[PDB]
């Protein structure tokens, strides 16, 4: 039922990026692993939702 009704999506899993400032606790705005969001993402996974 879900495979019939859902649309194909790419799912990628959140984790906090280890670029957070050890004092201020905020992300580095130049970080390449996360583009200023505090959250980095694992490689994408194909799923239907």
């Amino acid at each position: 039922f879900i495979n019939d009704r859902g649309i194909k999506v790419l799912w990628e899993e959140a984790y906090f990026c280890p670029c957070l400032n050890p004092d201020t606790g905020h992300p580095r705005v130049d970080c390449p692993r996360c583009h200023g969001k505090g959250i980095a993402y694992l490689p994408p996974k194909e799923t239907i939702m």
Binding site: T24, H26, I39
Partner: protein, 277 residues
Amino acid sequence: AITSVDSYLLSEIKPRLNTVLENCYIIDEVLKDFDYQTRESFKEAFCGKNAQHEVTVGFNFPKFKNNYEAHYLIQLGQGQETKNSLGSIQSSYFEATGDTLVESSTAIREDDKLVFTVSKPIGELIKVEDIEFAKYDNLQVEGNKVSFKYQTNEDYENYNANIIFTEKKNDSKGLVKGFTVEEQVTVVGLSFNVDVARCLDAVLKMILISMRDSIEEQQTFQLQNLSFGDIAPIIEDGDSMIFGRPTIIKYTSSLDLDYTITQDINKLTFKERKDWK
């Protein structure tokens, strides 16, 4: 300079908090007025090298969960400019001077002078600890070294001192232009245990009293003034409430810039010219 009271407070509070918490008799003195069981429970939980719980410090609005058992939340507040100088001239200098520093050092003999070595070029020497030199002592400063005549002072050939001084950036003239600001930062000790919140309040007040003597807020951040809020639930709809008592720390400080002057004049010259009309 431009200044950031919040980052100053974070940098200053964290080491002081650690050094109190690793030292049991300090807490035993700070909490002498609390109920015996409150005191002993706090000292058992958070205090000493074996402490299994820990306190934490950081700015507000993190994206992660904090140690809500005991956490100092730092929260930058309001401010306003209060006093201005004529021409906005906060000061003037003949030699661009950096931050004030205090460093430990030892004398050594060199070529029948005593010298103290300092890690950075001395822009100005404020004090050599526990020494006042006479003219006979031929006190001179050069680069990053202080130098001191050996002849009469041989007993002090390895004397240990603290040097209070300030860096130099460069040899240039200018005007320090700026103004004074009065600015507020809030700090709150969050805990889901009310007795922990009350103890964190006591510890923070002790830390701020101790901080008043530091060079940082003797030279800048002057006139620390404290206000205290009610104890209240900060968050009320978890499986438990989180409590805290705010304190507001207000500081008076200078915001200013080094306007360097390139113009220099090194000779007047005079001429007479004749008017035949």
